[PDB]
Every structure is written in structure tokens, then in C-alpha cells.
Amino acid sequence: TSRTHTSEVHGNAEVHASFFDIGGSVSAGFSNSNSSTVAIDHSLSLAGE
Amino acid sequence: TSRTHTSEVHGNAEVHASFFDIGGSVSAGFSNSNSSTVAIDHSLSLAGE
């Protein structure tokens, strides 16, 4: 059984460069993520000797 | 055969600038998931002592 909790710190940038539209910025923030996982697995083996 | 659920509200913060008028944009997103993984495996080993 597995459960994942991750927060990713998201950062971008906003730069426009054209003939009549320019402007600069920088962004910052953090996200959230909560997971949950069950796992079922079996086996077999036959070993002669 | 495992099944992964991940429930997130990923919130990003973005501020955008222009030539005269500057605004911003934040947004978070709720969601669901059934990202399941199935597997099939075969093996073979020979030892000698």
C-alpha cells in the first residue's frame, strides 16, 4: 500500500517582446498532490536440483 | 496488478505584465484518477556449485 504526498514549487516567467507589446514578470507558487495506491502481486517458482 | 489514485488541487500563481495594464492569474485544479498498472513476468536461472 502506497500513498504519495508531493507539493511542487511552480515558478514561471512572463516576457513579451513584439512591435507594440512588451512586459516582464516572474512567477512563484506551490502546488499540491495527494495519492493512494494498493498493489496485488503473486508468484510461482519450481526449482529442480 | 496495482491501481494508483491521485487526488490533487494543484495551485499555480502567475502574475503577468503588459505595456500599460498589469494583472494576475491564480488557478487550482481538482481531479480524479484511475492509473492502474498490470504486469506479467517470466524468469529463468541456472546456478552451479
Author numbering:
A (entry chain C), B (entry chain D): 295 to 343
Please quote the authors directly.
Therefore, we used a symmetry expansion method in Relion for 3D classification and were able to resolve the asymmetrically attached EF. Unlike LF, all the domains of EF are well resolved in our channel complex structures. β1 (Leu33 to Lys35) of EFN forms parallel β-sheet with β13 (Leu203 to Pro205) of PAN. LF α1 is angled downward towards the pore in the α-clamp site, while the amino-terminal end of EF α1 is elevated ~2.9 Å as measured using the carbonyl groups on LF Glu34 and EF Glu24. While in the PA7-bound EF structures, the HD domain contributes to a new conformation by bridging the PABD and ACD.
The toxin functions as a binary A2B toxin, with enzymatic A factors, lethal factor (LF, 91 kDa) and edema factor (EF, 89 kDa), and a cell binding B factor, protective antigen (PA, 83 kDa).
